[PDB]
Design a protein around this ligand. Structure first.
Ligand code: HEM
Length: 154
């Protein structure tokens, strides 16, 4: 499954705007994920007690987590599909330490697309959203193959 260089440029041009303030984008993506699919918050032992969007917004630890997640995903997207080294540690921790099913990776993908669609209409028109969806589908397909190698059905 393979993206064209033009699709990768549409992915990297919206990611450049995310990088103006990766912490703010991470907060919005995690609030969207937890609001839309509340069951995903139960996987975070440090954050599952948060009850409202205001508590989520005020959590310094959740802000730091959002920066970690988006910076790891950004490094994966900048490899333009050559991300085997980056996916190894991530697949292992998400399969075995955190136990994150592929369905929850689909939910965070949905949250990312929703937040980029809302914040970045200048760089997230239909063709760019289609390229980001392809990049995230590639990421989830390769993560799912690694999960199977690691012994996790998820
Ligand atoms: C775009 C997909 C994702 C990326 C790039 C990502 C990235 C990361 C990174 C870099 C870390 C820190 C190091 C590690 O333990 O691997 C992390 C931790 C974690 N991830 Fe993810 N993650 C993703 C999706 C998810 C989803 C969807 C969930 C749950 C629904 C999840 C649950 C967790 C948890 C529970 C931790 C430990 C958090 C803590 O220390 O409090 N991840 N993730």
């Amino acid at each position: 499954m393979v993206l064209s260089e033009g699709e990768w440029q549409l992915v990297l041009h919206v990611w450049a705007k995310v990088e103006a303030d990766v912490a703010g984008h991470g907060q919005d993506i995690y609030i969207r994920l937890f609001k839309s699919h509340p069951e995903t918050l139960e996987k975070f032992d440090r954050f599952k007690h948060l009850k409202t969007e205001a508590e989520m917004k005020a959590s310094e630890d959740l802000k730091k987590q959002g920066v970690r997640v988006l910076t790891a995903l950004g490094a994966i997207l900048k490899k333009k599909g050559h991300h085997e080294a980056e996916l190894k540690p991530l697949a292992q921790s998400h399969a075995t330490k955190h136990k994150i099913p592929i369905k929850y990776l689909e939910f965070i993908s949905e949250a990312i697309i929703h937040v980029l669609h809302s914040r970045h209409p200048g760089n997230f028109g239909a063709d760019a959203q289609g390229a980001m969806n392809k990049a995230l589908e590639l990421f989830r397909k390769d993560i799912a193959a690694k999960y199977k190698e690691l012994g996790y059905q998820g």
